[PDB]
Amino acid sequence: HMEIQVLKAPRAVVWKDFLGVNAQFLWFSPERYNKQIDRLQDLGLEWVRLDLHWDRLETAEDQYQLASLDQLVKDLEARQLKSVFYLVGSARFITTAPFYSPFQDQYPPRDPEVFARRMAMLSQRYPSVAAWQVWNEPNLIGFWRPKADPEGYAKLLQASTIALRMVDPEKPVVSAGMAFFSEMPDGRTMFDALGHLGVESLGTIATYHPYTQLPEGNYPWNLDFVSHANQINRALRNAGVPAIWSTEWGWSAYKGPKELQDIIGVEGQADYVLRRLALMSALDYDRIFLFTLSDLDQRASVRDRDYGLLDLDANPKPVYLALQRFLKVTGPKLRPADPPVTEDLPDGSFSIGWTREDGRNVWLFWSARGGNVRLPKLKEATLHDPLSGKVTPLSGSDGLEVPVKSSLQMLVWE
Ligand SMILES: [Cl-]
């Protein structure tokens, strides 16, 4: 038996355009988040995604707390960043929460038009913002209590879209990032239910947050990330969405105790992020956003503290250094191509081909069982290991011997 997953991207990828990061800048002093941005810019990236919680911005009806946000928006433009902001949660005066609920903000608003007016206010206040995103993970109980409500979310999205387009009719409106592949507890998907409600007529950008245990799936015997992503992306294109983003994905380096995600540490984080990036950049996404730019302090849950590219001091973690090496090897723009001819590529291999700007080919590959592969048509190539930083010239009189790892390697060849 021999199963190999080959991917070829549907279009060229320009990293500056394609790969953004989530960030939590308001958790930090301006000095600290400007250093985070220094690091982001050093990767050649510019897109950021930022969360806004309504209950934190409007702490009582028409009592706002905007000084920090005002300054951040000025700072983002001064650093030439392109930003997408999402607004989520109900302010206390508008929530559908029962009086004695402990999670007041996790209920949707009583009146969608009130929420919509706030998104319009924010957009009008901050014209530099590139896109506005409406709520977050409404298929997940923790963001929309007491039960997922496609009809309710559609009305909220409709009302927000109309209001945002009144402020600026040309600016993109992004629907909420759906948790995972948009599955709801009742066994339907939010994307499907919204399709029945005619939501595609709104023309909003569709997005979801396909976290999985491993880079290619949830179990070693069921690596079906690619299959799921292709299926949902095809369905979205068929419904005529203007674009598909993935606004969250990634892994935490936390040490435990285990909560949903297996413990993999800083080296596992580097490994998994790189493999998933190789996959997603070759799938039908227009833009994706890694979670997240920086580690967070103890205001975050134990797991959520360690998703960063950067540690708390805004210094590179292993995943940053690995991603940096990766992007240096690819260069800033990749065009779709085929992998080289192989002999005895190991079962379970992933295999992705690109061409860079200087015309050299780039092959991305790995397999859970490791091993070795022969490339009969090549006499010279250069092998890159972005996790270790090792660079290895390969040569042969009539073909190359290439070691295969469980982690991503990059072969540059012509
Ligand atoms: Cl290049």
Distance (angstroms) between ligand 1 centre and the Cα of 10 equals 20
Complete edge-to-edge strand list for the sheet that includes strand 206-209 = 173-175, 131-134, 82-88, 47-53, 19-23, 287-290, 244-246, 206-209, 178-179
**Are 381 and 401 spatial neighbours (Cβ–Cβ below 8 Å)?**
no
Among residues 348, 254, 242, 354, which one has the least CA distance to residue 287?
242
Q: Please measure the distance between the N-terminal and C-terminal CA atoms of the chain and give it in whole angstroms.
A: 31
Span from the CA of 349 to the centroid of ligand 1 (angstroms):
26
Tokens of 357: 């700007």
Considering only CA atoms, which of 414, 385, 388 is closest in space to residue 400?
414
HEC profile for the chain? Answer: CCCCEEECCCCCEEHHHHEEEEECHHHCCHHHHHHHHHHHHHCCCCEEEEEEEHHHHEEECCEECCHHHHHHHHHHHHCCCEEEEEEECCCCCCECCCCCCCCHHHCCECCHHHHHHHHHHHHHHCCCCCEEEECCCCCCHHHCCCCCCHHHHHHHHHHHHHHHHHHCCCCCEEECCEEECCECCCCCEHHHHHHHCCHHHHCCEEEEECCCCECCECECCECCHHHHHHHHHHHHHHCCCCCEEECCCCCCCCCCCCECECCCHHHHHHHHHHHHHHHHCCCCCCEEEECCCECCCCCCCCHHHHCCCECCCCCECHHHHHHHHHHHHHCCEEEEECCCCCECCCCCCEEEEEECCCCCEEEEEECCCCEEEEECCCCEEEEEECCCCEEEEEECCCCEEEEECCCCEEEEEC
Q: Report the alpha-carbon angle 329-79-266, nearest 5.
A: 45
Q: How far is the CA of 364 from the centre of ligand 1 (A)?
A: 16
On whether the CB atoms of residues 341 and 377 are closer than 8 A, the answer is yes
Distance 184 CA to ligand 1 centre (A): 43
User: 354 alpha carbon to ligand 1 midpoint, in Å?
Assistant: 11
357 alpha carbon – ligand 1 mean position (Å): 4
CA 41 – CA 35 distance, rounded (Å): 10
What is the 300 CA–ligand 1 centroid distance (Å)? 39
Pairing mode, strands 371-375 and 333-337: unpaired
Distance 11 CA to ligand 1 centre (A): 17
Angle at 209 (CA atoms; ends 205, 211), nearest 5 degrees: 160
Residue of 30, 64, 63, 52 whose CA lies nearest to 105:
52
The torsion angles phi and psi of 268, rounded to 5 degrees, stand at: -60, -45
* Alpha-carbon span 267 to 265, nearest angstrom: 6
Query: Resolution limit in angstroms?
Result: 2.0
Buried residues in 132-168 as b, exposed as e (16+ CB within 10 A): bbbbbbbbbbebbbeebbbebbbbbbbbbbebbbebe
Q: Which residues contact 174 (CB under 8 A, 6 or more apart)?
A: 84, 86, 131, 132, 133, 134, 204, 205, 207, 245, 247
Cβ neighbours around 36 below 10 Å, total: 22
Residue 363 β-bridge partners: 353, 411
Cβ neighbours of residue 300 closer than 8 Å, sequence gap 6 or more = none
Rounded Cα–Cα distance for residues 6 and 145 (Å): 41
- For the record, the structure tokens of 104 come out as 């007041």
Query: Which residue type is seen at 30?
Result: P
Q: Which two tokens stand for residue 276?
A: 């998933």
Supply angle C-alpha 57, 63, 67, rounded to 5: 50
- Nearest C-alpha neighbor of 340 from the set 309, 308, 304, 364: 364
Q: How many CB atoms lie within 10 A of CB 322?
A: 26
408: its two tokens:
């991503």
Structure obtained using: X-ray
How far, in Å, is the centroid of ligand 1 from the Cα of 280? 21
Cβ neighbours for 275, distance < 8 A, ≥ 6 positions apart: 215, 216, 350, 366, 407, 408
Structure tokens at 255: 């040490």
**Pairing between strand 244-246 and 206-209?**
parallel
What is the 198 CA–ligand 1 centroid distance (Å)?
44
Q: Are 23 and 292 in contact (CB under 8 A)?
A: yes
Beta bridge partners of 82: 47
Q: What are phi and psi of 363, to 5 degrees?
A: -115, 125
Token representation of residue 89: 């949660």
257 cis-preceded (ω within 30 degrees of 0): yes
Distance 360 CA to ligand 1 centre (A): 8
**Which of 228, 180, 211 is CA-nearest to residue 273?**
211
Between the CA of 39 and the centroid of ligand 1 the distance, in Å, is: 21
